[PDB]
Write a protein that binds this ligand. Structure first.
Ligand code: HEM
Ligand code: HEM
Ligand SMILES: Cc1cc(N)nc(-c2ccc(CNCCc3cccc(F)c3)cc2)c1
Ligand SMILES: Cc1cc(N)nc(-c2ccc(CNCCc3cccc(F)c3)cc2)c1
Ligand SMILES: C[C@H](O)[C@H](O)[C@H]1CNc2nc(N)[nH]c(=O)c2N1
Ligand SMILES: C[C@H](O)[C@H](O)[C@H]1CNc2nc(N)[nH]c(=O)c2N1
Ligand SMILES: [Cl-]
Ligand SMILES: [Cl-]
Lengths: 362, 362
């Protein structure tokens, strides 16, 4: 049954992949090879070409992602050769370094060995490779609430956070055959952070806000032709709203809107004053300004939506159906100022793709 | 077949209606009466109690409406007795007067005779009872683009607009048995309008913006227990974003964001400056300020969302399933600042309800 799922997925992927690569004539023989390989081993191994194009197709098919125009320029690093925790750690360090690229962020994915019998070879615990710790105890809240459960798990492994609002979590992952994950502190020289200042309002720096440069999602599964790459961290650059409208603004995250209102000199007393809306706009302006000033890549939601429009056009020109999740594609600030708000999207799931998977802790 | 649809809908409605009204014991005899009445006449007539509660249930079931907390205080005016165009006109004038209530807006619905064989008795052409005309010809655009087709239809009936940006469309409706609709100019004394000024920025008045006080939707069908009330205009007060984030801001509406940016003294040159977002916030502040200053009811999106939360709670307490359309319930400005953004809603259709219907022109 599982083999059949594998073979059916493989047939669909190879046909589509080789079509797009102008290799349609090679489909027949390649499928035969794979079919034999499944029969004998219970699985099959992707060529480097298949793996690279598969990761790109998976991004192209990610319904919730506004950044998909650039799917074909994804930098794919094949690390299916890793066998040791030192190799995994060094690969993750390298990913951070090469993706960061001194601020000129390169969209990158590092692909580790795939699941075998649904058995993971490498199990990454981090949500993102760079993320802040969170703490809550007897009433006191410190750091990023979204990291509370992982932070607590880490402190079960012998790690201890300094309990600033911006402690960098260590890398945490488990190797097949080990009962507990290992953790490694991030070399600070690898991690770019951006202090948040405002172009016009000098007092904004009093909030002492910062965010990290590069979002590197490390807890999703890349599925390509029936092969499950549960460990395959990927990154892009931020859209400013992710930081200014959500990470720093959500009541269940850093919850900074009242403090923002104060430093920009407006009252936070009356709903009809739209002080939350004004604070959100200024915080989002500050985020974009700060990343730009520091030479770290970022995109604003207007430019991002314009690029997404081009992605829609390119899909139509290539004769590919477009899929999207409207509820995630609209930016959380001024959504109706984008073309996305005013059309609809088919939210069908197409593979290859990136999927959520169960967490190994909690 | 149609009778069966009618009888099935009637059974569902009467049972539910009488339950909610504590009249469950009367359901049996009432259903018998209706069943006979359908047999003989092909239809049935609602009691005043049924009609009133039906209109209220229909609002309660309107998935796209954030304002539903107040469903049970809807003022229902029964005008099933009208037979002449003079009576219709006067009823519509009266609706405007009593709903407006000198600025302290009363949510009101006026219900006209229902369709018989799918044959309308009264056919209202207006989208809203008070709405601005729109014009486009050899390149020149005047007024509200969304009203262009109705405006053109009106000018086929002997009416002529002054071609300001805010011409009030006349009431336009057709009686059963007449081939053409009639039109009547709105008495200006009945129509409250609000000039848009800003609490802090004196130059905002240079834009010479205004909007009308009361949104009165006049082109939707109220369906209650299988009876189709195609003519049943209803009103509430505005949520500020409808005016400031959409009517005045949409590129395909009044398209005022660039002019707003200019009068508030910011550049409209760079996406990363978030000038559209800032302009939207100031325009929305001005809308709320202006309606408040003039003593015309309005609600901001934060307060409206808070009321909607109470509506959700009240549904749960009453043991009623909640339905909603997330994509319409989120406000078009700072949606993630509302609780609505962070939950999901079942978009199932429950009757009684209000529905779109085909336009009689174009
Ligand atoms: C290059 C710059 C990129 C930008 C600006 C961008 C933008 C975004 C944004 C704003 C989200 C929504 C996240 C949230 O609200 O939680 C998102 C989701 C997503 N992006 Fe992208 N993205 C980029 C690159 C990539 C890359 C390189 C991949 C993978 C190869 C990717 C795959 C996804 C996926 C899978 C999601 C969905 C996450 C989820 O369901 O929680 N994106 N993207
Ligand atoms: C009392 C104040 C009210 C407020 C603030 C309010 C708010 C809103 C808003 C903002 C919308 C979205 C409109 C759009 O974006 O196009 C809406 C939709 C709707 N409202 Fe309400 N509403 C109110 C009263 C009412 C009343 C009295 C009824 C009927 C009895 C009603 C029925 C609806 C319906 C049917 C829609 C959907 C319109 C469509 O699908 O195009 N509302 N409401
Ligand atoms: C590659 C990339 C670029 C970019 N600019 N953003 C992202 C990105 C950001 C955040 C997320 C996380 N989305 C939410 C996951 C989630 C889902 C449900 C509950 C939760 F607490 C968290 C995924 C991708 C990814
Ligand atoms: C009662 C009430 C109160 C309030 N504050 N707003 C409304 C209201 C406002 C606008 C609308 C119109 N919604 C869009 C109709 C539509 C749908 C599709 C295309 C179009 F051009 C227009 C409906 C109800 C209704
Ligand atoms: C295409 C999309 O459904 C459309 O733009 C909707 C989105 N959500 C909305 N929500 C409201 N309240 N009003 C609208 O006009 C719309 N437009
Ligand atoms: C409940 C709802 O689905 C949830 O709040 C979603 C809405 N749309 C979103 N869109 C993005 N981009 N990111 C998010 O976290 C969410 N949250
Ligand atoms: Cl993030
Ligand atoms: Cl409107």
């Amino acid at each position: 049954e599982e083999k059949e799922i594998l073979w059916n997925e493989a047939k669909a992927f190879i046909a589509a992949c080789y079509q797009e690569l102008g290799k349609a004539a090679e489909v027949k023989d390649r499928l035969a090879d794979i079919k034999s390989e499944i029969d004998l081993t219970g699985s099959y191994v992707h060529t480097k070409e298949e793996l690279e194009h598969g990761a790109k197709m998976a991004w192209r098919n990610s319904n919730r992602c506004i950044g998909r125009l650039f799917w074909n320029s994804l930098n794919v690093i094949d690390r299916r050769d890793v066998r040791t925790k030192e190799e995994v750690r060094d690969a993750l360090f390298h990913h951070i370094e090469t993706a960061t690229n001194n601020g000129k962020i390169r969209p990158t994915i590092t692909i580790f060995p795939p699941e075998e019998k649904g058995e993971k070879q490498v199990e990454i615990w981090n949500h993102q490779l760079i993320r802040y710790a969170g703490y809550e105890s007897d009433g006191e809240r410190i750091g990023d609430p979204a990291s509370c459960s992982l932070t607590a798990a880490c402190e079960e492994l012998g790690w201890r956070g300094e309990r600033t609002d911006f402690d960098l979590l260590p890398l945490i992952f488990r190797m097949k055959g080990d009962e507990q994950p290992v953790w490694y502190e991030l070399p600070r020289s690898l991690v770019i952070e951006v202090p948040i200042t405002h172009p016009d309002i000098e007092a904004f720096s009093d909030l002492e806000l910062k965010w990290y440069g590069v979002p590197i999602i490390s807890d999703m599964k890349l599925e390509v032709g029936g092969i499950h790459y549960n460990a395959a961290p990927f990154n892009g650059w931020y859209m400013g709203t992710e930081i200014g409208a959500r990470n720093l603004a959500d009541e269940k995250r850093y919850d900074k809107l009242k403090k923002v209102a104060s430093v920009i000199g407006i009252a936070a007393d009356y709903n009809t004053d739209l002080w939350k809306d004004q604070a959100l706009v200024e915080l989002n302006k500050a985020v974009l300004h700060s990343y730009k000033k520091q030479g770290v890549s970022i995109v604003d939601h207007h430019t991002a939506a314009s690029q997404f429009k081009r992605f829609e056009e390119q899909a139509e020109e290539a004769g590919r159906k477009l899929t999207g999740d409207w509820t995630w594609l609209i930016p959380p600030i001024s959504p109706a100022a984008t073309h996305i708000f005013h059309r609809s999207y088919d939210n069908s799931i197409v593979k290859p793709n990136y999927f959520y998977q169960d967490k190994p802790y909690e």
